[model samples]
Target: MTEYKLVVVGAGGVGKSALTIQLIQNHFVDEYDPTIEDSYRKQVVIDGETCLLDILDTAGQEEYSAMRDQYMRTGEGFLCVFAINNTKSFEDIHQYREQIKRVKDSDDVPMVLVGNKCDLAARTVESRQAQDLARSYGIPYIETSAKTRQGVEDAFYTLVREIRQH
Candidate 1:
């Protein structure tokens, strides 16, 4: 059986957990719910191949910066999530990427940029900027919506396929 440990990471309230939940369980939180603070591990099956995943639902806090390195080292890959409507969250992408690089030290550990909350396109940060950043880092980029289930699976599935191929 094949397995991968995936980390959904970003600043707080960027919908990392939302997209993760949507992709893994097909569910979305209705509103901003900081009260639900927790993390867990799970297993998934793709093409009958079993995957044991150490999935972390991380706290979107800069205080957790100290632990970021630890997560990156163990992660098979990471989803660098950002919110489409929130610029502050978007700004942290560079720092997050640097942290990942510091710990993993291997470009082969694929990272995917997820611009979440695509359902609120009217209030979005520039999509072009997101694309440019993702391009600069040599990662695939996609806008996802947990509310509409758009691009949710593609973000994870693309990473899995590319990681397996390489």
Candidate 2:
């Protein structure tokens, strides 16, 4: 069995915790306590290999920004999340990637650009924009609706597969 350390990052209200919770608990919550920092571990079978998925669900509020680098340092792979309805959150995707590069000192680490909250069709950020950014960073981009569980498994499985390859 393999073990992986994964971190989820993004602006607040973008559903990072919701996505993680959905992956682990198989359900979604309409309201969740604003996460300061939390860790979860799950056993998943990927490609017939059982592995431990250790996740660090990070805070999205600015007050917790100071701790991001520490979280960045410990992550083996990252899911950079953003809300499709919030352009501001989408705008910071590059900044998050840059921070990871600066902290990890490598641009080759596994990463996934996630556009969350897709269930709400009134999107401010266009899919093309998100996909282009991910293309620029040479990583996969996925649209997920944690509320509806759309693309939720794909997002996590993609990152886990990438980590295994890396």
Candidate lDDT scores, in order, read: 0.78, 0.93
Mind giving the per-residue lDDT tens digits that candidate 2 earns over 63-100?
88999989998999999999999999998777789999
Error of 2 at 79 (Å): 0.3
Question: Candidate 1 lDDT, tens digit per residue, 43-155?
Answer: 76765677765566676877666777777777777888898889988998888888888787765568889898888956557889999998888888888998899998888
Give the TM-score comparing model 1 with the true structure, all chains together: 0.87
Count of backbone clashes, every candidate in sequence: 0, 0
The best candidate in terms of TM-score: 2
Runs in model 2 lying further than 4 Å from the true structure: none
RMSD of 2: 0.9
Backbone clash pairs in model 1 (N, Cα, C under 3 Å; residues 3+ apart or in different chains), count: 0
Best by lDDT: 2
Clashing pairs in 2: none
